[PDB]
Amino acid sequence: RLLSALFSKDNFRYLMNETSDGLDVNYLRIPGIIENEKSLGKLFSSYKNLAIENLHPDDRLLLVDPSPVFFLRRPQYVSDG
Amino acid sequence: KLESMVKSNYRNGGLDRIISKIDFDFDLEL
Amino acid sequence: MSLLDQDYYLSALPEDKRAELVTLQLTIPLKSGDEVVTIDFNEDVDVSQLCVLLESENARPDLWLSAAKVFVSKGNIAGSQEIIRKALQSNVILDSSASVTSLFHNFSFWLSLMEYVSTNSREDQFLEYASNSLQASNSLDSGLILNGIGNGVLYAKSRRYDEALKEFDNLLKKKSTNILAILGKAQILYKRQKYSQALELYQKALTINPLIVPDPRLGIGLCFWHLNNKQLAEQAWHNSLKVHPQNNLNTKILICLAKFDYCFNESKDDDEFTALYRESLEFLHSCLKEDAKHPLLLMVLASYYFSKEDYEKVEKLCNLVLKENSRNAAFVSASHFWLARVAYHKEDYVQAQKQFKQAEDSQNSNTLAKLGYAQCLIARNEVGDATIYLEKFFKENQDSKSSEMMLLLGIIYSQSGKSYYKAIIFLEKYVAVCQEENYPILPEAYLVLSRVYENKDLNVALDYLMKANDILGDKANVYVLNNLGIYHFFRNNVSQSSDFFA
């Protein structure tokens, strides 16, 4: 039972190494990146219309740092007047 | 009291008996 | 709120990227002129006939490569290779520039990569084929960044991580919007155990493309597992499954593993533990109804069936996994560990120790195998040998939180007697680890600590004995009460000593 408790503590820690099958990257996987020779550039420029706002709120919740404040302006050079 | 409530048989080492009390039928090839 | 699915990011994208990118029908102009032919890939498209028709009509190479990509989606890697070869035999590519031939060489490179990936075998042969195709592509057209990406992937497969990282640095110099470069860099960083550094790349890729394959959320969940935020990992994996409900059973496997871990480490009562464990078993079985030969699923089920005293079926599954996935050393280690655990009931101490050693040699990260090896050494009365092995493991892994290892070290040193100071250190470390883990502290460690402190500090020994008695409650024994009474007698606590003696 001591080894059973040790297994429960460890569970399946070192068994996730094989589960890295999702890390492999292949060009042909994307459906629309290849239909034209420049479809890669089109899709890279297709998401320029999108931004963080267009992301789903739940997917935005997945963006966790490992809000603007009114008193931090972005610097300028010409000012106004 | 949740810190003391969580302490039970599986933490004490009776986990294997608990799994033995859980019966399930699989479609095993072997 | 807005539904989180594939259709969400479909509607987010313009309709040009919605329907055209997923067309299953290919339009091919004919050589006769304005005549065209439309062939739906839903039907059984023959590779040879389609290639012959394309060669006769001399269609644009885009159609050839799109058909190759679709046949890749169909799994016809041989068919896609035939398409590429006959395209190289076609008049269009022969009369086109070397750029088209280089692009088709890179497509054949991707075909070799997929052939290796789908089998996880014949790695050298497919790697050489891919290298030759990529070298031909680079010679024909060296300005294509896809050739650089292929070079980096080739370096990663051969574990030439520095060269691949340099290639991705060059790609970042070219442009920072390259999603594939980000994915490759993050994969290398994860391979180099740079979980957080790969995590920023994962987040950037996900923000740039939520519909990119491979899924960044898999890496994000892996990082959350590395950062202990496994709840967010499970949530992101659920979102990925919503986006990718097909050909992504690995996400379901990870979800099942996370559920099992939560059941093990969070169940507040036996009934809740049973409910969660049975729910995890049912989900694992439901995933198994799709694939019944996945080695990791068999290895996971081996734990349950070992707990069910079904050692024979555990042996069957372990042997089957060893026969299939002997390439993966971790599965060999797990199977050896489970065989040793089974033989422990048979008390094949020599055989179990040999199996534990083989498990350690297969995968050194298996601490449980080494602990079973030490336990088998104890079984064979090898007190000194077990002590030497344990000291070696502790000195190599002083940062490892193996509480039971430290408890065993303390017990061994207490039996030795002269090493009482290491015994105190190890028992205190075990106590601290158990308190941090909210696990029941063994009163035997308290008794050993009190026995050691008898010759050093009667106060600390008495305090530890009181703590052990409080843990025991009604489980108090005659020796504990007698020692408490003697402690109070030496403390001149006549009343308390008399009460303990009574």
Coordinates of C-alpha atoms in Angstrom, one line a residue:
Chain A
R1 CA 0.0 0.0 0.0
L2 CA 3.0 2.3 0.4
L3 CA 3.8 1.9 -3.3
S4 CA 0.1 2.4 -4.0
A5 CA 0.2 5.7 -2.2
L6 CA 3.4 6.6 -4.0
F7 CA 1.6 5.9 -7.3
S8 CA -1.3 8.1 -6.3
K9 CA 1.1 10.9 -5.4
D10 CA 2.9 10.5 -8.8
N11 CA -0.3 9.4 -10.7
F12 CA 0.8 9.8 -14.4
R13 CA 3.4 12.6 -14.2
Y14 CA 6.1 11.1 -16.4
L15 CA 3.6 9.4 -18.8
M16 CA 2.7 12.8 -20.4
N17 CA 6.0 12.7 -22.4
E18 CA 4.5 10.6 -25.1
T19 CA 1.4 12.8 -25.2
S20 CA 3.5 15.5 -27.0
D21 CA 2.1 14.2 -30.3
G22 CA 0.3 17.6 -30.6
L23 CA 3.7 19.4 -30.7
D24 CA 4.5 18.1 -34.2
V25 CA 3.8 20.7 -36.9
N26 CA 3.0 19.8 -40.5
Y27 CA 2.1 22.2 -43.3
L28 CA -0.5 20.0 -44.9
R29 CA -2.7 19.9 -41.8
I30 CA -4.3 23.3 -42.4
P31 CA -7.0 23.0 -45.0
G32 CA -6.8 26.5 -46.6
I33 CA -3.1 27.3 -46.2
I34 CA -2.2 25.4 -49.4
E35 CA -5.1 25.9 -51.9
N36 CA -3.1 28.7 -53.5
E37 CA 0.7 29.1 -53.4
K38 CA 0.2 32.4 -51.5
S39 CA -2.6 31.1 -49.3
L40 CA 0.0 31.1 -46.5
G41 CA 0.4 34.8 -46.9
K42 CA -3.4 35.3 -47.3
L43 CA -4.2 33.4 -44.1
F44 CA -1.4 35.2 -42.3
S45 CA -3.0 38.4 -43.5
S46 CA -6.5 37.0 -43.0
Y47 CA -6.2 37.3 -39.2
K48 CA -4.9 40.9 -39.4
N49 CA -8.6 41.8 -39.6
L50 CA -9.0 39.9 -36.3
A51 CA -7.5 40.8 -33.0
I52 CA -7.8 40.0 -29.3
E53 CA -11.3 41.5 -29.3
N54 CA -12.5 39.0 -31.9
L55 CA -11.3 36.1 -29.7
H56 CA -13.9 34.2 -27.8
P57 CA -14.4 35.5 -24.2
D58 CA -13.6 32.0 -22.8
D59 CA -10.5 31.8 -25.1
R60 CA -9.6 35.3 -23.8
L61 CA -9.8 33.8 -20.3
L62 CA -7.2 31.3 -21.4
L63 CA -4.8 34.3 -21.9
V64 CA -3.5 34.4 -18.4
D65 CA -0.3 36.4 -17.6
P66 CA 2.4 33.9 -16.2
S67 CA -6.2 46.7 -18.1
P68 CA -5.2 50.2 -19.1
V69 CA -4.9 53.0 -16.5
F70 CA -6.0 56.5 -17.3
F71 CA -2.7 58.1 -16.2
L72 CA -0.3 56.3 -18.6
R73 CA -0.4 58.1 -21.9
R74 CA 1.3 56.8 -25.0
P75 CA 4.1 59.1 -26.0
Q76 CA 3.8 61.6 -28.9
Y77 CA 6.1 63.8 -30.8
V78 CA 4.1 66.6 -32.4
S79 CA 1.7 67.4 -29.5
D80 CA -1.0 69.9 -30.5
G81 CA -2.0 73.5 -30.5
Chain B
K1 CA -13.1 20.8 8.8
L2 CA -12.5 20.0 5.2
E3 CA -8.8 19.4 5.9
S4 CA -9.7 16.7 8.4
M5 CA -12.7 15.4 6.3
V6 CA -10.5 14.7 3.3
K7 CA -8.4 12.3 5.5
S8 CA -10.0 8.9 4.8
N9 CA -9.1 5.3 3.8
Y10 CA -7.4 6.1 0.5
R11 CA -5.1 8.6 2.1
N12 CA -4.6 6.1 5.0
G13 CA -3.8 3.5 2.4
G14 CA -7.1 1.7 1.8
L15 CA -7.3 3.0 -1.7
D16 CA -6.9 -0.5 -3.3
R17 CA -9.8 -1.8 -1.2
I18 CA -11.9 1.1 -2.4
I19 CA -11.1 0.4 -6.0
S20 CA -12.0 -3.3 -5.3
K21 CA -15.4 -2.1 -4.0
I22 CA -15.9 -0.3 -7.4
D23 CA -16.9 -2.8 -10.0
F24 CA -17.1 -2.1 -13.8
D25 CA -17.1 -4.3 -16.9
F26 CA -14.8 -3.4 -19.8
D27 CA -14.8 -4.7 -23.4
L28 CA -11.3 -6.0 -22.9
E29 CA -9.5 -7.7 -25.9
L30 CA -7.2 -9.6 -23.5
Chain C
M1 CA -23.1 34.5 -24.7
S2 CA -21.5 33.7 -28.0
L3 CA -21.1 29.9 -28.5
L4 CA -17.5 28.7 -28.4
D5 CA -17.1 26.3 -31.3
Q6 CA -15.5 26.1 -34.7
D7 CA -18.4 28.1 -36.2
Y8 CA -17.5 31.0 -33.9
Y9 CA -14.1 31.5 -35.6
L10 CA -15.7 30.6 -38.9
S11 CA -18.1 33.5 -38.6
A12 CA -15.2 35.6 -37.2
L13 CA -13.3 35.1 -40.5
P14 CA -14.8 36.4 -43.8
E15 CA -16.9 34.0 -45.9
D16 CA -13.9 33.8 -48.3
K17 CA -12.0 31.8 -45.7
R18 CA -15.1 29.9 -44.5
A19 CA -16.3 27.9 -47.5
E20 CA -13.5 28.0 -50.0
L21 CA -10.8 26.8 -47.7
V22 CA -12.8 23.7 -46.9
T23 CA -14.1 22.8 -50.4
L24 CA -14.3 19.1 -51.0
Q25 CA -14.8 19.7 -54.8
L26 CA -11.9 20.6 -57.1
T27 CA -12.4 22.4 -60.3
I28 CA -9.9 21.5 -63.1
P29 CA -9.9 23.3 -66.5
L30 CA -9.5 21.0 -69.5
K31 CA -6.9 21.3 -72.3
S32 CA -9.7 21.7 -74.8
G33 CA -10.2 25.3 -73.6
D34 CA -13.0 26.8 -71.5
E35 CA -14.2 23.2 -70.5
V36 CA -13.7 22.4 -66.8
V37 CA -14.3 19.3 -64.7
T38 CA -15.4 19.3 -61.0
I39 CA -14.5 16.2 -59.0
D40 CA -15.9 15.9 -55.4
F41 CA -13.4 14.4 -52.9
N42 CA -16.4 13.0 -50.9
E43 CA -16.6 10.3 -53.6
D44 CA -13.9 7.7 -54.0
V45 CA -11.4 9.6 -56.1
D46 CA -8.8 7.4 -57.9
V47 CA -5.3 8.7 -57.7
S48 CA -4.2 7.2 -61.0
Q49 CA -7.2 8.4 -63.1
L50 CA -7.1 11.8 -61.6
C51 CA -3.4 12.2 -62.2
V52 CA -3.8 11.0 -65.8
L53 CA -6.6 13.5 -66.4
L54 CA -4.6 16.3 -64.8
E55 CA -1.6 15.5 -67.0
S56 CA -3.7 15.4 -70.1
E57 CA -5.4 18.7 -69.4
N58 CA -2.1 20.2 -68.0
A59 CA -3.9 22.0 -65.1
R60 CA -2.2 24.5 -62.8
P61 CA 0.1 23.0 -60.1
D62 CA -2.2 24.5 -57.5
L63 CA -4.8 21.9 -58.3
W64 CA -2.3 19.0 -58.2
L65 CA -1.0 20.1 -54.8
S66 CA -4.5 20.7 -53.4
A67 CA -5.5 17.2 -54.5
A68 CA -2.4 15.9 -52.8
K69 CA -3.3 17.8 -49.6
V70 CA -6.9 16.3 -49.7
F71 CA -5.5 12.8 -50.2
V72 CA -3.3 13.5 -47.3
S73 CA -6.4 14.3 -45.3
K74 CA -7.8 11.0 -46.6
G75 CA -4.7 9.3 -45.3
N76 CA -3.5 8.3 -48.8
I77 CA 0.1 9.1 -48.2
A78 CA 1.1 6.8 -51.0
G79 CA -1.5 8.4 -53.2
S80 CA -0.2 11.9 -52.4
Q81 CA 3.3 10.8 -53.2
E82 CA 2.1 9.4 -56.5
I83 CA 0.3 12.7 -57.2
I84 CA 3.6 14.6 -56.5
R85 CA 5.7 12.3 -58.7
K86 CA 3.3 12.4 -61.7
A87 CA 3.1 16.1 -61.3
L88 CA 6.9 16.2 -61.6
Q89 CA 6.3 14.1 -64.7
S90 CA 3.6 16.6 -65.9
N91 CA 4.3 19.1 -68.7
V92 CA 3.3 22.1 -66.5
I93 CA 6.0 21.6 -63.9
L94 CA 8.6 20.8 -66.5
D95 CA 7.8 24.0 -68.3
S96 CA 7.3 26.0 -65.1
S97 CA 10.1 27.6 -63.1
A98 CA 12.2 25.8 -60.6
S99 CA 10.1 27.3 -57.9
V100 CA 7.2 25.0 -58.6
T101 CA 9.4 22.0 -58.6
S102 CA 10.9 23.1 -55.3
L103 CA 7.4 23.5 -53.8
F104 CA 6.5 20.0 -54.9
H105 CA 9.8 18.7 -53.5
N106 CA 8.9 20.3 -50.2
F107 CA 5.4 18.7 -50.5
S108 CA 7.1 15.3 -50.9
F109 CA 9.2 16.2 -47.8
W110 CA 6.0 16.8 -45.8
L111 CA 4.7 13.5 -47.2
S112 CA 7.8 11.7 -45.9
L113 CA 7.3 13.4 -42.5
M114 CA 3.7 12.3 -42.4
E115 CA 4.6 8.8 -43.3
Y116 CA 7.1 8.6 -40.5
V117 CA 4.7 10.3 -38.1
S118 CA 1.7 8.0 -38.9
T119 CA 3.9 4.9 -38.2
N120 CA 6.7 6.0 -35.8
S121 CA 9.0 3.6 -37.5
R122 CA 11.6 3.5 -40.3
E123 CA 12.8 6.9 -39.0
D124 CA 16.1 6.9 -40.8
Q125 CA 14.8 6.0 -44.2
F126 CA 12.0 8.5 -44.3
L127 CA 14.3 11.1 -42.8
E128 CA 16.7 10.5 -45.6
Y129 CA 14.0 10.7 -48.2
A130 CA 12.7 14.0 -46.7
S131 CA 16.3 15.4 -46.5
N132 CA 16.9 14.6 -50.2
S133 CA 13.6 16.2 -51.3
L134 CA 14.3 19.3 -49.1
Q135 CA 17.8 19.6 -50.5
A136 CA 16.5 19.4 -54.0
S137 CA 13.9 22.0 -53.2
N138 CA 16.5 24.4 -51.7
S139 CA 18.8 23.9 -54.7
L140 CA 15.9 24.7 -57.0
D141 CA 14.5 27.6 -55.0
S142 CA 16.5 28.6 -51.9
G143 CA 14.4 31.8 -51.3
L144 CA 11.4 29.9 -50.0
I145 CA 10.9 30.2 -46.2
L146 CA 9.2 26.8 -46.3
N147 CA 12.5 25.3 -47.1
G148 CA 13.9 26.9 -43.9
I149 CA 11.0 25.6 -41.9
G150 CA 11.6 22.1 -43.3
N151 CA 15.3 22.4 -42.4
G152 CA 14.4 23.4 -38.9
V153 CA 12.0 20.5 -38.5
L154 CA 14.7 18.1 -39.9
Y155 CA 17.1 19.5 -37.2
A156 CA 14.4 19.0 -34.5
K157 CA 13.8 15.4 -35.6
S158 CA 17.5 14.7 -35.5
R159 CA 17.7 16.7 -32.2
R160 CA 19.8 19.4 -33.8
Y161 CA 18.0 22.0 -31.7
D162 CA 20.6 24.8 -32.0
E163 CA 20.4 24.8 -35.9
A164 CA 16.6 24.8 -35.8
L165 CA 16.6 27.6 -33.3
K166 CA 18.9 29.6 -35.6
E167 CA 16.6 28.9 -38.5
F168 CA 13.6 30.2 -36.5
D169 CA 15.6 33.3 -35.5
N170 CA 16.2 33.9 -39.2
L171 CA 12.5 33.4 -39.8
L172 CA 11.7 35.9 -37.0
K173 CA 14.1 38.3 -38.7
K174 CA 12.2 37.9 -42.0
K175 CA 8.7 38.4 -40.3
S176 CA 7.2 38.0 -36.9
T177 CA 3.8 36.9 -38.1
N178 CA 5.0 33.4 -39.1
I179 CA 2.7 31.1 -37.1
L180 CA 4.6 27.9 -38.1
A181 CA 7.9 29.5 -36.9
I182 CA 6.3 30.2 -33.6
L183 CA 4.9 26.7 -33.3
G184 CA 8.3 25.2 -34.1
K185 CA 10.1 27.4 -31.7
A186 CA 7.6 26.6 -28.9
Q187 CA 8.0 22.8 -29.7
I188 CA 11.8 23.1 -29.4
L189 CA 11.5 25.1 -26.1
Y190 CA 9.2 22.5 -24.7
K191 CA 11.6 19.8 -25.8
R192 CA 14.3 21.8 -24.0
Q193 CA 11.9 22.0 -21.0
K194 CA 11.4 25.8 -21.4
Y195 CA 7.7 25.5 -20.5
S196 CA 7.1 29.2 -19.8
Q197 CA 9.1 30.4 -22.9
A198 CA 7.1 27.9 -25.0
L199 CA 4.0 29.1 -23.2
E200 CA 4.3 32.7 -24.4
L201 CA 4.8 31.4 -28.0
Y202 CA 1.7 29.2 -27.5
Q203 CA -0.4 32.2 -26.4
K204 CA 0.9 34.3 -29.3
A205 CA 0.1 31.6 -31.8
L206 CA -3.4 31.1 -30.3
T207 CA -4.1 34.8 -30.5
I208 CA -2.8 35.0 -34.1
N209 CA -4.7 31.9 -35.2
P210 CA -7.3 30.1 -33.0
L211 CA -7.9 27.6 -35.9
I212 CA -4.3 26.6 -36.5
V213 CA -3.2 22.9 -36.6
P214 CA -1.5 21.7 -34.5
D215 CA -3.5 23.0 -31.6
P216 CA -1.6 25.5 -29.4
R217 CA -4.1 24.8 -26.6
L218 CA -2.5 21.4 -26.1
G219 CA 0.8 23.1 -25.3
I220 CA -1.0 25.6 -23.2
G221 CA -2.6 22.8 -21.2
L222 CA 0.8 21.1 -20.8
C223 CA 2.3 24.4 -19.5
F224 CA -0.7 24.8 -17.1
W225 CA 0.1 21.3 -15.9
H226 CA 3.7 22.4 -15.4
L227 CA 2.4 25.5 -13.7
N228 CA -0.1 23.5 -11.5
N229 CA -3.1 25.4 -13.1
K230 CA -4.5 22.2 -14.4
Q231 CA -8.1 23.5 -14.2
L232 CA -7.3 26.0 -16.9
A233 CA -5.6 23.2 -18.8
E234 CA -8.7 21.1 -18.7
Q235 CA -10.9 24.1 -19.7
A236 CA -8.6 24.9 -22.7
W237 CA -8.6 21.2 -23.7
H238 CA -12.4 21.2 -23.6
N239 CA -12.4 24.3 -25.8
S240 CA -10.0 22.6 -28.2
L241 CA -12.2 19.5 -28.4
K242 CA -15.1 21.8 -29.2
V243 CA -13.0 23.3 -32.0
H244 CA -11.4 19.9 -32.9
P245 CA -13.9 17.1 -32.2
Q246 CA -12.2 14.7 -34.6
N247 CA -8.8 13.0 -34.8
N248 CA -7.9 14.5 -31.3
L249 CA -8.3 11.6 -28.9
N250 CA -5.1 12.7 -27.2
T251 CA -7.0 15.6 -25.7
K252 CA -9.6 13.2 -24.3
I253 CA -6.8 11.1 -22.8
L254 CA -5.3 14.2 -21.1
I255 CA -8.7 15.1 -19.8
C256 CA -9.2 11.6 -18.3
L257 CA -5.7 11.8 -16.7
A258 CA -6.6 15.2 -15.2
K259 CA -9.9 13.8 -13.9
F260 CA -8.1 10.8 -12.3
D261 CA -5.5 13.1 -10.7
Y262 CA -8.3 15.3 -9.3
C263 CA -10.1 12.3 -7.9
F264 CA -6.9 11.0 -6.3
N265 CA -5.8 14.4 -4.7
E266 CA -9.1 16.2 -4.0
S267 CA -11.8 13.7 -3.1
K268 CA -13.1 14.8 0.3
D269 CA -14.8 11.5 1.2
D270 CA -14.8 7.8 0.1
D271 CA -18.2 8.1 -1.7
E272 CA -17.0 11.1 -3.6
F273 CA -13.8 9.3 -4.5
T274 CA -15.9 6.3 -5.7
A275 CA -18.2 8.5 -7.8
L276 CA -15.3 10.4 -9.4
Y277 CA -13.2 7.3 -10.0
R278 CA -16.2 5.5 -11.7
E279 CA -16.9 8.6 -13.8
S280 CA -13.3 8.7 -15.0
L281 CA -13.5 4.9 -15.7
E282 CA -16.6 5.4 -17.8
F283 CA -15.1 8.3 -19.7
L284 CA -12.0 6.3 -20.4
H285 CA -14.1 3.4 -21.6
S286 CA -16.1 5.6 -23.8
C287 CA -12.9 6.9 -25.4
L288 CA -11.8 3.2 -25.6
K289 CA -14.8 2.4 -27.7
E290 CA -13.1 4.4 -30.5
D291 CA -9.6 3.0 -30.0
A292 CA -9.1 -0.3 -28.1
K293 CA -5.4 -0.8 -28.7
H294 CA -3.9 2.5 -27.5
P295 CA -0.9 1.5 -25.4
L296 CA -1.3 4.4 -22.9
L297 CA -5.0 3.5 -22.2
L298 CA -4.0 -0.2 -21.6
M299 CA -1.2 1.0 -19.2
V300 CA -3.7 3.2 -17.3
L301 CA -6.3 0.4 -17.1
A302 CA -3.5 -1.9 -15.8
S303 CA -3.4 0.2 -12.6
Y304 CA -7.1 -0.3 -12.0
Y305 CA -7.0 -4.0 -12.8
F306 CA -4.0 -4.5 -10.5
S307 CA -6.0 -2.8 -7.8
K308 CA -8.8 -5.3 -8.8
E309 CA -6.4 -8.2 -8.2
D310 CA -6.6 -9.0 -11.9
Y311 CA -2.9 -9.6 -12.2
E312 CA -3.2 -12.0 -15.1
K313 CA -4.9 -9.4 -17.4
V314 CA -2.4 -6.8 -16.2
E315 CA 0.4 -9.1 -17.4
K316 CA -1.4 -9.6 -20.7
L317 CA -1.8 -5.9 -21.3
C318 CA 1.8 -5.2 -20.2
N319 CA 3.2 -7.8 -22.6
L320 CA 1.1 -6.6 -25.5
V321 CA 2.2 -3.0 -24.9
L322 CA 5.8 -4.2 -24.7
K323 CA 5.4 -6.0 -28.0
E324 CA 3.8 -3.0 -29.7
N325 CA 5.6 0.0 -28.2
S326 CA 9.1 -1.3 -27.4
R327 CA 10.4 1.8 -29.1
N328 CA 9.0 4.0 -26.3
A329 CA 11.1 3.3 -23.2
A330 CA 8.5 4.9 -20.8
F331 CA 6.0 2.2 -21.7
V332 CA 8.6 -0.5 -21.1
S333 CA 9.4 1.0 -17.7
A334 CA 5.7 1.1 -16.8
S335 CA 5.1 -2.5 -17.9
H336 CA 8.2 -3.6 -16.0
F337 CA 7.0 -1.8 -12.9
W338 CA 3.6 -3.4 -13.1
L339 CA 5.1 -6.8 -13.6
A340 CA 7.3 -6.3 -10.5
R341 CA 4.2 -5.1 -8.6
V342 CA 2.3 -8.3 -9.6
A343 CA 5.3 -10.5 -8.7
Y344 CA 5.5 -8.8 -5.3
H345 CA 2.3 -10.6 -4.3
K346 CA 4.1 -13.7 -5.5
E347 CA 7.1 -12.4 -3.6
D348 CA 9.5 -13.1 -6.4
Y349 CA 12.0 -10.8 -4.7
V350 CA 14.8 -11.5 -7.1
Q351 CA 12.5 -11.3 -10.1
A352 CA 10.7 -8.2 -8.9
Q353 CA 14.0 -6.5 -8.1
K354 CA 15.2 -7.3 -11.6
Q355 CA 12.0 -6.0 -13.1
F356 CA 12.4 -2.8 -11.1
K357 CA 15.9 -2.4 -12.3
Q358 CA 14.8 -2.9 -15.9
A359 CA 12.1 -0.3 -15.4
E360 CA 14.6 2.2 -14.0
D361 CA 17.0 1.5 -17.0
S362 CA 14.2 2.0 -19.5
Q363 CA 13.0 5.3 -18.1
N364 CA 15.1 6.9 -15.3
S365 CA 12.3 9.4 -14.4
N366 CA 10.2 6.5 -12.9
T367 CA 10.8 7.2 -9.2
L368 CA 8.2 4.5 -8.2
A369 CA 10.3 1.9 -9.9
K370 CA 13.4 2.8 -7.9
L371 CA 11.3 2.9 -4.7
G372 CA 10.1 -0.6 -5.5
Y373 CA 13.7 -1.6 -6.1
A374 CA 14.6 -0.4 -2.7
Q375 CA 11.6 -2.2 -1.2
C376 CA 12.7 -5.4 -2.9
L377 CA 16.2 -4.9 -1.5
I378 CA 14.6 -4.6 2.0
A379 CA 12.6 -7.8 1.2
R380 CA 15.8 -9.7 0.5
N381 CA 17.2 -8.5 3.9
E382 CA 19.7 -6.3 2.0
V383 CA 19.8 -3.6 4.7
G384 CA 23.2 -2.2 3.7
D385 CA 22.5 -2.5 -0.1
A386 CA 19.2 -0.8 0.3
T387 CA 20.8 1.9 2.4
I388 CA 23.6 2.5 -0.2
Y389 CA 21.0 2.7 -3.0
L390 CA 18.8 5.1 -1.1
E391 CA 21.8 7.3 -0.2
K392 CA 22.8 7.4 -3.9
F393 CA 19.3 8.3 -5.0
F394 CA 18.9 11.0 -2.3
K395 CA 22.3 12.6 -3.0
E396 CA 21.5 12.6 -6.7
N397 CA 17.9 13.8 -6.1
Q398 CA 18.1 16.0 -3.0
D399 CA 15.4 18.2 -4.4
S400 CA 13.0 15.3 -5.1
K401 CA 9.9 15.3 -2.8
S402 CA 9.8 11.6 -2.2
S403 CA 8.3 11.7 1.3
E404 CA 8.2 7.9 1.7
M405 CA 11.8 7.6 0.6
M406 CA 12.8 10.1 3.4
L407 CA 10.6 8.2 5.9
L408 CA 12.4 4.9 5.0
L409 CA 15.8 6.7 5.3
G410 CA 14.9 7.9 8.7
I411 CA 13.7 4.4 9.8
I412 CA 16.9 2.8 8.5
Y413 CA 19.1 5.4 10.2
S414 CA 17.2 5.0 13.5
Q415 CA 17.8 1.2 13.2
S416 CA 21.5 2.1 12.6
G417 CA 21.5 4.5 15.5
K418 CA 24.7 6.3 14.8
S419 CA 23.0 8.3 11.9
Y420 CA 20.3 9.8 14.2
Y421 CA 20.8 13.3 12.8
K422 CA 20.0 12.2 9.2
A423 CA 17.0 10.3 10.6
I424 CA 15.8 13.5 12.3
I425 CA 16.3 15.5 9.1
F426 CA 14.4 13.0 7.0
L427 CA 11.6 12.5 9.4
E428 CA 11.1 16.3 9.7
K429 CA 11.1 16.6 5.9
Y430 CA 8.5 13.8 5.7
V431 CA 6.4 15.6 8.3
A432 CA 6.6 18.9 6.5
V433 CA 5.8 17.3 3.1
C434 CA 2.8 15.5 4.5
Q435 CA 1.5 18.7 6.2
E436 CA 1.9 20.6 2.9
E437 CA 0.1 17.8 1.1
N438 CA -2.7 17.4 3.8
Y439 CA -1.9 13.7 4.1
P440 CA -2.1 11.7 7.4
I441 CA 1.3 11.9 9.1
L442 CA 2.3 8.4 10.2
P443 CA 2.6 8.3 14.0
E444 CA 5.5 5.8 13.6
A445 CA 7.7 8.7 12.4
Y446 CA 6.7 10.5 15.6
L447 CA 7.7 7.5 17.7
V448 CA 11.0 7.2 15.9
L449 CA 11.7 10.9 16.5
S450 CA 10.8 10.6 20.2
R451 CA 13.1 7.5 20.5
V452 CA 16.0 9.5 18.9
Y453 CA 15.3 12.6 21.0
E454 CA 15.3 10.5 24.2
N455 CA 19.1 10.9 24.2
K456 CA 19.0 14.5 23.0
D457 CA 15.8 16.4 24.2
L458 CA 13.2 14.9 26.4
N459 CA 10.9 17.9 25.7
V460 CA 10.9 17.4 22.0
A461 CA 10.5 13.6 22.4
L462 CA 7.5 14.1 24.8
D463 CA 5.9 16.7 22.4
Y464 CA 6.3 14.2 19.4
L465 CA 4.8 11.4 21.6
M466 CA 1.9 13.7 22.4
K467 CA 1.3 14.5 18.8
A468 CA 1.4 10.7 17.9
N469 CA -1.1 10.0 20.7
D470 CA -3.4 12.8 19.4
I471 CA -3.2 11.3 15.9
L472 CA -4.0 7.8 17.2
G473 CA -6.9 9.0 19.4
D474 CA -8.5 5.7 20.5
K475 CA -5.6 3.8 18.8
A476 CA -3.3 4.7 21.8
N477 CA -1.3 1.7 22.9
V478 CA 0.2 0.6 26.3
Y479 CA 3.8 1.5 25.3
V480 CA 2.8 5.1 24.3
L481 CA 1.0 5.7 27.6
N482 CA 3.9 4.1 29.6
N483 CA 6.4 6.3 27.8
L484 CA 4.3 9.4 28.4
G485 CA 4.0 8.6 32.1
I486 CA 7.7 8.1 32.3
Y487 CA 8.3 11.4 30.5
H488 CA 6.1 13.2 33.0
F489 CA 7.7 11.4 35.9
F490 CA 11.1 12.6 34.7
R491 CA 9.5 16.0 34.3
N492 CA 8.2 15.7 37.9
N493 CA 4.6 16.0 36.6
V494 CA 3.3 13.6 39.3
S495 CA -0.4 14.1 38.4
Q496 CA 0.1 13.7 34.6
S497 CA 2.4 10.7 35.1
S498 CA -0.1 9.1 37.4
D499 CA -2.9 9.7 34.9
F500 CA -0.9 8.2 32.1
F501 CA 0.0 5.2 34.2
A502 CA -3.6 4.7 35.1

